Amino acid sequence: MGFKTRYGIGINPFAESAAQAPASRIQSGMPSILNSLGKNAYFRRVYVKGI
Amino acid sequence: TQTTVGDIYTHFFQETGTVYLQASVQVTIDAGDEDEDEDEDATDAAKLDAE
Structure with a gap:
Protein backbone atom coordinates (compact mmCIF):
# COMPACT_ATOMS: atom_id res chain seq x y z
CA MET A 1 0.00 0.00 0.00
CA GLY A 2 1.14 3.52 -0.79
CA PHE A 3 0.06 7.13 -0.58
CA LYS A 4 0.40 10.08 -2.94
CA THR A 5 -0.54 13.76 -2.88
CA ARG A 6 0.37 17.00 -4.66
CA TYR A 7 0.52 20.37 -2.89
CA GLY A 8 3.10 22.81 -4.27
CA ILE A 9 4.09 26.12 -2.65
CA GLY A 10 4.75 29.62 -3.92
CA ILE A 11 6.44 32.87 -2.94
CA ASN A 12 4.35 35.99 -2.49
CA PRO A 13 4.36 39.00 -4.83
CA PHE A 14 6.43 41.93 -3.56
CA ALA A 15 8.38 39.45 -1.42
CA GLU A 16 11.82 40.80 -2.30
CA SER A 17 10.49 44.39 -2.09
CA ALA A 18 13.94 45.72 -3.06
CA ALA A 19 13.30 45.88 -6.81
CA GLN A 20 10.64 48.03 -8.46
CA ALA A 21 9.71 45.62 -11.25
CA PRO A 22 9.52 41.90 -12.06
CA ALA A 23 12.32 40.49 -14.16
CA SER A 24 10.53 39.06 -17.20
CA ARG A 25 6.87 40.14 -17.25
CA ILE A 26 5.75 36.57 -16.48
CA GLN A 27 7.92 34.89 -13.85
CA SER A 28 7.65 31.83 -11.65
CA GLY A 29 6.09 32.46 -8.26
CA MET A 30 7.87 29.51 -6.69
CA PRO A 31 10.74 29.92 -4.21
CA SER A 32 14.30 29.33 -5.39
CA ILE A 33 17.90 30.38 -4.75
CA LEU A 34 17.76 33.59 -6.78
CA ASN A 35 14.33 34.73 -5.59
CA SER A 36 13.64 33.56 -2.02
CA LEU A 37 16.94 32.62 -0.34
CA GLY A 38 17.39 35.11 2.49
CA LYS A 39 15.80 37.94 0.52
CA ASN A 40 12.21 37.96 1.76
CA ALA A 41 11.07 40.97 3.77
CA TYR A 42 8.23 39.32 5.69
CA PHE A 43 10.54 37.41 8.05
CA ARG A 44 13.71 38.12 10.04
CA ARG A 45 15.55 35.56 12.16
CA VAL A 46 18.22 36.24 14.79
CA TYR A 47 20.27 33.65 16.64
CA VAL A 48 20.54 33.88 20.42
CA LYS A 49 23.78 32.73 22.04
CA GLY A 50 24.58 33.15 25.72
CA ILE A 51 21.52 31.59 27.33
CA THR B 1 34.04 18.50 0.70
CA GLY B 32 39.14 25.84 6.00
CA ASP B 33 42.29 25.40 8.09
CA GLU B 34 40.87 25.09 11.62
CA ASP B 35 39.23 22.64 14.07
CA GLU B 36 42.42 20.98 15.30
CA ASP B 37 44.74 21.12 18.31
CA GLU B 38 43.06 24.02 20.14
CA ASP B 39 39.67 22.29 20.47
CA GLU B 40 40.36 19.46 22.97
CA ASP B 41 36.60 19.19 23.44
CA ALA B 42 34.97 16.03 22.09
CA THR B 43 34.81 13.30 19.44
CA ASP B 44 35.25 13.67 15.69
CA ALA B 45 31.51 13.76 14.98
CA ALA B 46 30.84 16.38 17.66
CA LYS B 47 33.56 18.52 16.08
CA LEU B 48 31.99 18.40 12.61
CA ASP B 49 28.52 19.24 13.94
CA ALA B 50 29.82 22.34 15.72
CA GLU B 51 31.46 23.68 12.56
Missing part, protein backbone atom coordinates in the same frame (compact mmCIF):
# COMPACT_ATOMS: atom_id res chain seq x y z
CA GLN B 2 33.78 21.64 -1.42
CA THR B 3 30.34 23.24 -1.54
CA THR B 4 28.80 24.46 -4.79
CA VAL B 5 26.04 27.06 -4.95
CA GLY B 6 22.53 25.79 -5.60
CA ASP B 7 23.35 22.22 -4.58
CA ILE B 8 21.75 20.25 -1.75
CA TYR B 9 23.53 18.52 1.13
CA THR B 10 22.17 16.43 3.98
CA HIS B 11 23.45 15.86 7.49
CA PHE B 12 22.42 14.33 10.82
CA PHE B 13 23.11 16.13 14.09
CA GLN B 14 23.96 14.08 17.17
CA GLU B 15 21.74 16.18 19.45
CA THR B 16 18.91 17.47 17.24
CA GLY B 17 18.42 15.04 14.35
CA THR B 18 18.80 15.03 10.57
CA VAL B 19 18.34 17.99 8.24
CA TYR B 20 18.99 18.89 4.59
CA LEU B 21 21.10 21.95 3.78
CA GLN B 22 21.36 23.89 0.51
CA ALA B 23 24.62 25.76 0.00
CA SER B 24 24.38 29.41 -1.04
CA VAL B 25 28.10 30.29 -1.20
CA GLN B 26 30.99 28.01 -2.12
CA VAL B 27 33.08 27.12 0.93
CA THR B 28 35.18 24.29 2.35
CA ILE B 29 33.20 22.39 4.96
CA ASP B 30 35.89 21.19 7.35
CA ALA B 31 37.01 24.50 8.81
Whole structure:
Protein backbone atom coordinates (compact mmCIF):
# COMPACT_ATOMS: atom_id res chain seq x y z
CA MET A 1 0.00 0.00 0.00
CA GLY A 2 1.14 3.52 -0.79
CA PHE A 3 0.06 7.13 -0.58
CA LYS A 4 0.40 10.08 -2.94
CA THR A 5 -0.54 13.76 -2.88
CA ARG A 6 0.37 17.00 -4.66
CA TYR A 7 0.52 20.37 -2.89
CA GLY A 8 3.10 22.81 -4.27
CA ILE A 9 4.09 26.12 -2.65
CA GLY A 10 4.75 29.62 -3.92
CA ILE A 11 6.44 32.87 -2.94
CA ASN A 12 4.35 35.99 -2.49
CA PRO A 13 4.36 39.00 -4.83
CA PHE A 14 6.43 41.93 -3.56
CA ALA A 15 8.38 39.45 -1.42
CA GLU A 16 11.82 40.80 -2.30
CA SER A 17 10.49 44.39 -2.09
CA ALA A 18 13.94 45.72 -3.06
CA ALA A 19 13.30 45.88 -6.81
CA GLN A 20 10.64 48.03 -8.46
CA ALA A 21 9.71 45.62 -11.25
CA PRO A 22 9.52 41.90 -12.06
CA ALA A 23 12.32 40.49 -14.16
CA SER A 24 10.53 39.06 -17.20
CA ARG A 25 6.87 40.14 -17.25
CA ILE A 26 5.75 36.57 -16.48
CA GLN A 27 7.92 34.89 -13.85
CA SER A 28 7.65 31.83 -11.65
CA GLY A 29 6.09 32.46 -8.26
CA MET A 30 7.87 29.51 -6.69
CA PRO A 31 10.74 29.92 -4.21
CA SER A 32 14.30 29.33 -5.39
CA ILE A 33 17.90 30.38 -4.75
CA LEU A 34 17.76 33.59 -6.78
CA ASN A 35 14.33 34.73 -5.59
CA SER A 36 13.64 33.56 -2.02
CA LEU A 37 16.94 32.62 -0.34
CA GLY A 38 17.39 35.11 2.49
CA LYS A 39 15.80 37.94 0.52
CA ASN A 40 12.21 37.96 1.76
CA ALA A 41 11.07 40.97 3.77
CA TYR A 42 8.23 39.32 5.69
CA PHE A 43 10.54 37.41 8.05
CA ARG A 44 13.71 38.12 10.04
CA ARG A 45 15.55 35.56 12.16
CA VAL A 46 18.22 36.24 14.79
CA TYR A 47 20.27 33.65 16.64
CA VAL A 48 20.54 33.88 20.42
CA LYS A 49 23.78 32.73 22.04
CA GLY A 50 24.58 33.15 25.72
CA ILE A 51 21.52 31.59 27.33
CA THR B 1 34.04 18.50 0.70
CA GLN B 2 33.78 21.64 -1.42
CA THR B 3 30.34 23.24 -1.54
CA THR B 4 28.80 24.46 -4.79
CA VAL B 5 26.04 27.06 -4.95
CA GLY B 6 22.53 25.79 -5.60
CA ASP B 7 23.35 22.22 -4.58
CA ILE B 8 21.75 20.25 -1.75
CA TYR B 9 23.53 18.52 1.13
CA THR B 10 22.17 16.43 3.98
CA HIS B 11 23.45 15.86 7.49
CA PHE B 12 22.42 14.33 10.82
CA PHE B 13 23.11 16.13 14.09
CA GLN B 14 23.96 14.08 17.17
CA GLU B 15 21.74 16.18 19.45
CA THR B 16 18.91 17.47 17.24
CA GLY B 17 18.42 15.04 14.35
CA THR B 18 18.80 15.03 10.57
CA VAL B 19 18.34 17.99 8.24
CA TYR B 20 18.99 18.89 4.59
CA LEU B 21 21.10 21.95 3.78
CA GLN B 22 21.36 23.89 0.51
CA ALA B 23 24.62 25.76 0.00
CA SER B 24 24.38 29.41 -1.04
CA VAL B 25 28.10 30.29 -1.20
CA GLN B 26 30.99 28.01 -2.12
CA VAL B 27 33.08 27.12 0.93
CA THR B 28 35.18 24.29 2.35
CA ILE B 29 33.20 22.39 4.96
CA ASP B 30 35.89 21.19 7.35
CA ALA B 31 37.01 24.50 8.81
CA GLY B 32 39.14 25.84 6.00
CA ASP B 33 42.29 25.40 8.09
CA GLU B 34 40.87 25.09 11.62
CA ASP B 35 39.23 22.64 14.07
CA GLU B 36 42.42 20.98 15.30
CA ASP B 37 44.74 21.12 18.31
CA GLU B 38 43.06 24.02 20.14
CA ASP B 39 39.67 22.29 20.47
CA GLU B 40 40.36 19.46 22.97
CA ASP B 41 36.60 19.19 23.44
CA ALA B 42 34.97 16.03 22.09
CA THR B 43 34.81 13.30 19.44
CA ASP B 44 35.25 13.67 15.69
CA ALA B 45 31.51 13.76 14.98
CA ALA B 46 30.84 16.38 17.66
CA LYS B 47 33.56 18.52 16.08
CA LEU B 48 31.99 18.40 12.61
CA ASP B 49 28.52 19.24 13.94
CA ALA B 50 29.82 22.34 15.72
CA GLU B 51 31.46 23.68 12.56
